[PDB]
Design an enzyme around this catalytic site. Sequence first.
Site, mmCIF file in Angstrom:
data_model
loop_
_atom_site.group_PDB
_atom_site.id
_atom_site.type_symbol
_atom_site.label_atom_id
_atom_site.label_comp_id
_atom_site.label_asym_id
_atom_site.label_seq_id
_atom_site.Cartn_x
_atom_site.Cartn_y
_atom_site.Cartn_z
ATOM 1 N N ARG A 88 -11.550 -0.308 -6.618
ATOM 2 C CA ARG A 88 -11.328 -0.972 -7.895
ATOM 3 C C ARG A 88 -10.949 -2.448 -7.786
ATOM 4 O O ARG A 88 -11.428 -3.271 -8.561
ATOM 5 C CB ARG A 88 -10.235 -0.245 -8.682
ATOM 6 C CG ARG A 88 -9.887 -0.902 -10.018
ATOM 7 C CD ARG A 88 -8.523 -0.443 -10.524
ATOM 8 N NE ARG A 88 -7.464 -0.856 -9.609
ATOM 9 C CZ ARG A 88 -6.189 -0.501 -9.719
ATOM 10 N NH1 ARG A 88 -5.801 0.289 -10.710
ATOM 11 N NH2 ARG A 88 -5.302 -0.935 -8.833
ATOM 12 N N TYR A 107 -6.560 2.873 8.535
ATOM 13 C CA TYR A 107 -5.836 1.851 7.794
ATOM 14 C C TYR A 107 -5.136 2.448 6.570
ATOM 15 O O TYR A 107 -3.978 2.132 6.290
ATOM 16 C CB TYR A 107 -6.773 0.734 7.332
ATOM 17 C CG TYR A 107 -6.056 -0.289 6.484
ATOM 18 C CD1 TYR A 107 -5.176 -1.208 7.060
ATOM 19 C CD2 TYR A 107 -6.191 -0.290 5.094
ATOM 20 C CE1 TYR A 107 -4.447 -2.096 6.278
ATOM 21 C CE2 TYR A 107 -5.464 -1.173 4.303
ATOM 22 C CZ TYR A 107 -4.594 -2.072 4.902
ATOM 23 O OH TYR A 107 -3.866 -2.937 4.122
ATOM 24 N N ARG A 148 -8.510 -11.465 0.918
ATOM 25 C CA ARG A 148 -8.325 -10.251 1.708
ATOM 26 C C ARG A 148 -9.531 -9.328 1.609
ATOM 27 O O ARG A 148 -10.153 -9.214 0.551
ATOM 28 C CB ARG A 148 -7.077 -9.497 1.249
ATOM 29 C CG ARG A 148 -5.776 -10.252 1.447
ATOM 30 C CD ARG A 148 -4.599 -9.391 1.025
ATOM 31 N NE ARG A 148 -4.810 -8.802 -0.297
ATOM 32 C CZ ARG A 148 -5.036 -9.502 -1.405
ATOM 33 N NH1 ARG A 148 -5.083 -10.828 -1.359
ATOM 34 N NH2 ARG A 148 -5.218 -8.879 -2.560
ATOM 35 N N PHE A 177 4.752 13.893 -11.209
ATOM 36 C CA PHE A 177 4.807 12.743 -10.318
ATOM 37 C C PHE A 177 3.573 12.669 -9.427
ATOM 38 O O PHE A 177 3.077 11.585 -9.132
ATOM 39 C CB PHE A 177 6.052 12.824 -9.431
ATOM 40 C CG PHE A 177 6.066 11.811 -8.325
ATOM 41 C CD1 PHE A 177 6.542 10.522 -8.545
ATOM 42 C CD2 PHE A 177 5.551 12.132 -7.072
ATOM 43 C CE1 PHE A 177 6.502 9.565 -7.531
ATOM 44 C CE2 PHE A 177 5.507 11.182 -6.055
ATOM 45 C CZ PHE A 177 5.983 9.896 -6.286
HETATM 46 C C1 LIG Z 1 3.210 13.085 -2.547
HETATM 47 O O1 LIG Z 1 2.059 12.304 -2.224
HETATM 48 C C2 LIG Z 1 1.427 11.851 -3.427
HETATM 49 C C3 LIG Z 1 0.557 10.656 -3.051
HETATM 50 C C4 LIG Z 1 1.281 9.352 -3.383
HETATM 51 O O2 LIG Z 1 0.711 8.426 -2.460
HETATM 52 C C5 LIG Z 1 1.145 7.134 -2.492
HETATM 53 C C6 LIG Z 1 0.555 6.270 -1.553
HETATM 54 C C7 LIG Z 1 0.965 4.922 -1.532
HETATM 55 C C8 LIG Z 1 1.944 4.470 -2.439
HETATM 56 C C9 LIG Z 1 2.326 3.094 -2.285
HETATM 57 C C10 LIG Z 1 2.711 1.950 -2.152
HETATM 58 C C11 LIG Z 1 3.223 0.577 -1.986
HETATM 59 O O3 LIG Z 1 4.051 0.565 -0.808
HETATM 60 C C12 LIG Z 1 2.038 -0.406 -1.820
HETATM 61 N N1 LIG Z 1 2.091 -1.483 -2.880
HETATM 62 C C13 LIG Z 1 2.001 -0.874 -4.253
HETATM 63 C C14 LIG Z 1 3.173 0.116 -4.498
HETATM 64 C C15 LIG Z 1 4.070 0.130 -3.219
HETATM 65 C C16 LIG Z 1 4.591 -1.311 -2.984
HETATM 66 C C17 LIG Z 1 3.377 -2.247 -2.751
HETATM 67 C C18 LIG Z 1 2.520 5.378 -3.388
HETATM 68 C C19 LIG Z 1 3.508 4.996 -4.337
HETATM 69 C C20 LIG Z 1 4.822 5.457 -4.080
HETATM 70 C C21 LIG Z 1 5.587 4.966 -2.976
HETATM 71 C C22 LIG Z 1 6.904 5.435 -2.736
HETATM 72 C C23 LIG Z 1 7.489 6.402 -3.594
HETATM 73 C C24 LIG Z 1 6.736 6.896 -4.694
HETATM 74 C C25 LIG Z 1 5.418 6.429 -4.937
HETATM 75 N N2 LIG Z 1 2.093 6.673 -3.370
#
Ligand SMILES: COCCCOc1ccc(C#C[C@@]2(O)CN3CCC2CC3)c(Cc2ccccc2)n1
Lengths: 332, 332, 329, 325, 330, 328
Positions: free
Chosen positions: E182, E135, E192, E252
């Site tokens: 969290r 998931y 959920r 980042f």
């Molecule tokens: C290089 O890998 C480093 C690990 C970063 O891993 C992640 C994993 C998941 C997410 C996310 C997300 C979401 O789609 C889920 N919800 C919260 C933020 C968004 C919109 C709704 C994010 C946030 C994200 C999503 C797209 C672009 C930048 C950051 N990051």
Amino acid sequence: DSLSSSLKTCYKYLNQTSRSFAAVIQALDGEMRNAVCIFYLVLRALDTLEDDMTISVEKKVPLLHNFHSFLYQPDWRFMESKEKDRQVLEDFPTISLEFRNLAEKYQTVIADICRRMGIGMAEFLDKHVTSEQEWDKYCHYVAGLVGIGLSRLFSASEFEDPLVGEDTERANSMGLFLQKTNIIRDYLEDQQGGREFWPQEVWSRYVKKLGDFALPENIDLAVQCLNELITNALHHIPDVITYLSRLRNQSVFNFCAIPQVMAIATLAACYNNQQVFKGAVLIAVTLMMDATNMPAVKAIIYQYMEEIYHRIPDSNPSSSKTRQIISTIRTQ
Amino acid sequence: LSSSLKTCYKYLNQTSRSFAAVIQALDGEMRNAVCIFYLVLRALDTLEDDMTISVEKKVPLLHNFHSFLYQPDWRFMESKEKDRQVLEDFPTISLEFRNLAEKYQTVIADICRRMGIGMAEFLDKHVTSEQEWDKYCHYVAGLVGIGLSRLFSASEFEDPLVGEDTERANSMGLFLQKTNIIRDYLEDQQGGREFWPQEVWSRYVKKLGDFALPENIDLAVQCLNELITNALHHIPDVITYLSRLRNQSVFNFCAIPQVMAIATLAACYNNQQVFKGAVLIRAVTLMMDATNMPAVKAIIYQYMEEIYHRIPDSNPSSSKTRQIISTIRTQN
Amino acid sequence: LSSSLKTCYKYLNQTSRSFAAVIQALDGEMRNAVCIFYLVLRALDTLEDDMTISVEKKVPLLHNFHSFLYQPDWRFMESKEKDRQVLEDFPTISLEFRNLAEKYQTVIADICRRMGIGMAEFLDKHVTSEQEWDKYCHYVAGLVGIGLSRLFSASEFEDPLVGEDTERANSMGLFLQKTNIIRDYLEDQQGGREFWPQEVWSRYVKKLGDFALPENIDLAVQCLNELITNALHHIPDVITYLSRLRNQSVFNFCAIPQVMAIATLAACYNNQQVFKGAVLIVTLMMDATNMPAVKAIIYQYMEEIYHRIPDSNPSSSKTRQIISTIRTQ
Amino acid sequence: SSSLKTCYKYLNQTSRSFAAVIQALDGEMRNAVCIFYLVLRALDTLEDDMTISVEKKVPLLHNFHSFLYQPDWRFMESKEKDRQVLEDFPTISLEFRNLAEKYQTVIADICRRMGIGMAEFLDKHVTSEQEWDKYCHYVAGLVGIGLSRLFSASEFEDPLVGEDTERANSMGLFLQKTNIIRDYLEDQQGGREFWPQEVWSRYVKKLGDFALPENIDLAVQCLNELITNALHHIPDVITYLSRLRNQSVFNFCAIPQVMAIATLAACYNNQQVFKAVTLMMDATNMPAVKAIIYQYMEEIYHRIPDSNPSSSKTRQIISTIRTQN
Amino acid sequence: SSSLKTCYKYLNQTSRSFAAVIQALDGEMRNAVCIFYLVLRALDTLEDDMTISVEKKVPLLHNFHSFLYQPDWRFMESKEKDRQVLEDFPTISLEFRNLAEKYQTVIADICRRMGIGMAEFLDKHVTSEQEWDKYCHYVAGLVGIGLSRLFSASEFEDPLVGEDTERANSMGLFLQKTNIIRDYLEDQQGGREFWPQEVWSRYVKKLGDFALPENIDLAVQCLNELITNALHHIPDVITYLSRLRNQSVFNFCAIPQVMAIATLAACYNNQQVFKGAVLIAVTLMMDATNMPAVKAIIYQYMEEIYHRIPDSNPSSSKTRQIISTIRTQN
Amino acid sequence: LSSSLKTCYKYLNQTSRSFAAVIQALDGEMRNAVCIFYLVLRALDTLEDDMTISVEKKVPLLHNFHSFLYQPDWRFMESKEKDRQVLEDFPTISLEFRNLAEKYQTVIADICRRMGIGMAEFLDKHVTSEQEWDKYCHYVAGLVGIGLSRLFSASEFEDPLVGEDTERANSMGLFLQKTNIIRDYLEDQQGGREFWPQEVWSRYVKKLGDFALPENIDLAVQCLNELITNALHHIPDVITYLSRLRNQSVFNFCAIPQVMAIATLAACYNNQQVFKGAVAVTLMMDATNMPAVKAIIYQYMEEIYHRIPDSNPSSSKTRQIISTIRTQ
Ligand SMILES: COCCCOc1ccc(C#C[C@@]2(O)CN3CCC2CC3)c(Cc2ccccc2)n1
Ligand SMILES: COCCCOc1ccc(C#C[C@@]2(O)CN3CCC2CC3)c(Cc2ccccc2)n1
């Protein structure tokens, strides 16, 4: 264009008096550039006073002793020299002005060296070099201290490690190697000028008068002496390598290495060579590399050591000593 | 320090004209490892080259040479070659070999073992096909490139890849070896030695020695050009190999010999002088040496053009020569 | 690799004696981008040179050249110039141009567009004043230095500050161009081309061609020295531009040609041979691959000139002044 | 020398916000910037001394740059807190004359120009926003320009840094406008007015009216309009900081800018003026500084009340800063 | 660009913990990552909208990636908070199409595969720990993979980054697992469930029981077991971060990870997780912008957890085990 | 991973609260080398600290400690210290030690040997002169800084020049040691030992333990300020040493502790709490880059300077050293 015309004049003098260091000095990074240029010019003026034989010993000694203080006397100049580089003495105010414009930390180093050199130069005005120990002392005064001073400027500028200025023995060896080499090379010229720099305790074991090496019938004894002195000089090479290996600034490395390599090439060309006593001397894997990185400098040095090694006459009286020092240089 | 190690470096400088200096300039543990590797290969070659040693005695010597490295008292006192000192005093060299870290010993002995077998295989035959030419060059040079590469990687001054990519390392040795074989045609023919592949030269004349006959100069030069073209095929690998080096002392050691070899081929290409003695080792190059990869690439590319500019349309290999150079030009 | 790319490098070596090697030595993507930039400029230069192309036909070719880079079938078959092959097989070159990343394409097309305008502007006139000289040199060489600098930064091999410094990049090109113009006096005079600034040479003779006459050698050498003195003024910018570079392959590419041009001015200075044909060229214990060494080499060449300056020469003080400025700062 | 030691003693005694970052500068820049600060401190002290008559102050501001070359010049009639730098100016001027000439020319030139501007605003207050920029130019913009020329002259930074005077000017303006906006109350309770007249007049009759509770609502609106004005400098600030390559210089330049931005975000729509990711990153690398800046821009943006007269503009400038690149 | 200007408005509008580090990315990554985030926001907003029937929702998720090339596509029937990105999707898709193909390729491929996974879990809850990873892979792991591919494609980072999908997947799972842990209460109150049934069912009959005061001790034990599970991704996080070379990319990546680790340390053996919000000294002298500093910070938080491990906790051994592995791995 | 290496790191974290994290953050081979180095030194220190061992028994244990590293079965089960686990389970530590490359083992053993010798020297005598104070500090801290510097160079993550600078490496250790000594006065008083130089405190009170008595508080803070003024003289070497480092992991490892120590000396200066219990721009930057470290240091030097009472017997000295640091 607005800036210092006095500094422009100093660089003119630098190029006017130095055929071997002007280019590499002007290539030094930031603050080192002006400090080293000025250091060279003040030393040039001091050297010109020492060399001028129209100045009696009595009149000269006080000039040598106080030269370091004249750096702080804005209007001081010397108009009675008849030496070719007398322009730096006649226009010393322009040079001392820029010396006083350098950061204090550099002034302190330069003045200290000038003071010490003046003392040593005065000491040798009424005596020739006797022992090899006295030869090192004299070379220390006119060259060793310069290596020390230059090293102190490098550390003070922070372009090099504090250790560079601290290890005065290695810095001293850098100056001694260059000085002994020039002295060995300029035998004929110096002899024709009335000055003698070859250690008495060495040439005396060959002839009655140093000037005798200039006469053909003594060529054999001369070359033998020549090789003994060259062998003496070679003992500084290990220190030279250590010193260069500690440098981390490219402009400083070029400045220090190029002159050392040219000196080593001069000894190799003078070794067991009769031309040293008849006049001036002149110049393959090395032609592929320049003296700008440590491994290349080492390679260049070893090539010259082998060039000397394979020309060592079993006949010559320094054979065993020459081979031994070269072996020490080779086995790191 | 060690009396035996100093002796080794003495032998290195006495026997190696073009590698002694770059070897002595190598960093840390690579220095002694490579010095010893050179000396053992020098001893091995001296045995293979001695025509006063019967085949009956020579095959065992070549096959077992590698094991003599482990036998403290082994030496050979019947050599009539100029470098026999290394064989007569082999115990001094083998002692130092055994003092090297075990990882370096593995490499050196492995290469000596494989080289010995190969040399023995060619005692009774000349080189026929170009494939055999490669095999021979592998045995006396390619394996050396491979060994050196393994030493560099074992010492950790270079990445593991340098030692792992044996084909690229093999190419380094082959390029040097083929270049020397091409250049030394006349000297070898006058020495009773034949190294030019028979399947190649037989397509031109009846006897390899015929190329020394003025009336065969045209055919000789054509053959020369075919072999040079063959050697040029190793250049892509040479550039790849050198591009992977990160240690300055190692880079100098590897790059300089390759550049000199390339300069040599350029000087020999379509040059009748090859068959009348040694050749004249002949722009934007002058201002740069072979101490950084980009400069080495530029120097190599310039030499490729010197060759390209001289390719006559009538030469039988002209299209092939243009083809490989074009590949070297275009490859990034 | 690519058939067309192999061909481009074939053309690079056919049309370049002094740049091909350092271009081929450039890292990554700069290699192909600079190779292509060279080739399209060679084509543009050949069009400008061809005296068999009427001015009214040439103006549109120069103005529109940049657009031809995007016309797959565009080629020019009516040239009689020595490098005409790049024009007749331009589709092969434009194809590889279109294979370059867009960031490189944009820089190259922009420089071609601007250069085309400048070359067209000077077709019906000769360089008059020294300012006009700088303008013409800007068009044919300054813009190239600017374009190359932008390619370096675009590739990320050099800092963005390199491409941003258009003033000094321009000086890099002006220096090489003026040096070639000075050295090639005779070659150009016999070719019907005049590049020496009229406001300068007219103070010496009635016709620029007069410097070719043996009885004007004295006046000729004076004008030569004045032009060289003018060229020397770009050296401070060159040293500053080179000092900024951080990529070794880029440094060699930029530094070597500048040092070669400096060596050329030194050989031509106060040299009567310039008007009779071609002039051939510490300094040996160091090559031009690190900045401090390049500085030392330049300073040695400056002293080479300085020591040979004649008091009588009308530019003598100016020549010392610029060399002094170079030495001092 | 003891004189250089004394200079640094004064630096530490007079500068809370810059003493540390100045002493952390590499090589030559250290003494040059230390001296530049002290001479500007001496000039400002003269400028603020109200016990000095106009006819006496004007020429002093105009001629201050000339005192740098007069070994014995000193001022013994100041009653200000930092009067020591004026009474012992010979110590500071001595070290100025010991700096390399290239630094001396810059410092003297800037001091001459700032003195002209300072004398110009003695007899007047700031009216238009354009005059506000002019005033900030004279007391701060020129400082950024001077500093930039020193960085370039030292070779520690690119020639471009000293040449782009507009970006350098913006660095100074942002800091000055921020302090002016922030120090509103303290200035009023001191007899000085720095907020542009053509701005506050549109909210009150007297700038001092903002202090009174009954006007707090109009005061905050004016406060937000000025902050919005200041925000326009941020794009140049990012551009300027983006060109820096020396760590000591970057720290020296970036830290004060971020602290200033943090200050504007705290004052935005805040009444007290008239009375996340951040915590894991500091301002020592450009990408971090950017992140930090964007954070504060959002703190402000998320607090822009639709009822505020500048709401639209504020949003527009923050938007431009966000989409930059 | 007014459309791109709007995209950044939305970014700052929806993202509180990423907008700043995204806008700080060098060159082409800036817009590529900004767009990538907005499209995922829209995709997630649809998956979250319970006012959308399953038969109507499945199509949306499965074909979302294709709406990127449909200039006029948009969703007007969403009642969620971030419906703006859907109602004005045309603006977002426009900018997407302005991106270099290589970036579009990555983004669309991830949207496609993500949509498949989301649709899949529409009718089921997370059971096994294996399914929890699955998931998380669909909603976070693939995001780390997509971002890494964007980094390598931009060339600001080496090809390895985008190549090691495992390490990239781990980066996403650590963030997602931390947030799921969290946000237990908020999610529970929202109807959920994200905690794996095979883990929580060993403590209580219903996941919702952890929201009852009487089960606070069992809740914390489950909490500690899930945190111990998430800690296993730390080795991969350190490896992944240690390979980055671009400062803007490092910040980042490192900041959110360090913030997640700080969060787990605060939540460990903390009853507050079931009552409200949990707000996050050699560390004092450090920020998360250089690898060695990041390592030091992570290690400190690990000892913060290690020092609070209860002897009687059912996961004590496992917790000490993974922490010990993290301490020792060079 | 080896269970023996995991155990070492377990002990590292057990016996260290301010170094464990930066040690584990070191690059490549430095990581395990420094960890092991810390562990062995902890064991050695634990022996000295144990007052249950007779001087006749302790001396040998100190003089030969460096040899126990090569004795697989060596251990000590007679300690009463809190960190005896390292002594009781030393074999696990020596094993990993012997796993270190030879170049690291050499350095570590040498320091242990020279340290043991020096330590045994002060088993009976106390610190008399300041000269003697540096001597003792050189043994328990100074030599550690040298060992560390040598490991940095040996690993090659740092230039050979770093290990060569024994003087400043020594100052690095002395600074940290004097700081902990000055700070932990009361704990060491209520512990049995006295580390404050006798020649110094015996010029304020007759018994070093007197500073613990309220009727001396003033004389106390005066002696305190005088010692801090002494430690401050090392800062110039600290800055110089730190300025030479090029490896980020090594810099963080060296810089953080030095900065924490400086912050400590600033908090203690002219502070009475020292004799009772424990104790902007700076907040914008952390100690991970040299310019920031300089700024932070300078701000602390200002915190102390503006609090220097012109009455204190050291006031002049304190201002003089700070002035030197500021103009350095
Ligand atoms: C290089 O890998 C480093 C690990 C970063 O891993 C992640 C994993 C998941 C997410 C996310 C997300 C979401 O789609 C889920 N919800 C919260 C933020 C968004 C919109 C709704 C994010 C946030 C994200 C999503 C797209 C672009 C930048 C950051 N990051
Ligand atoms: C950072 O800039 C350093 C200064 C280099 O400046 C310049 C200036 C001009 C040129 C040129 C040119 C030409 O267009 C003119 N002719 C000779 C070479 C080409 C084709 C015909 C060149 C040669 C060139 C042009 C394109 C690619 C590589 C080299 N270099």
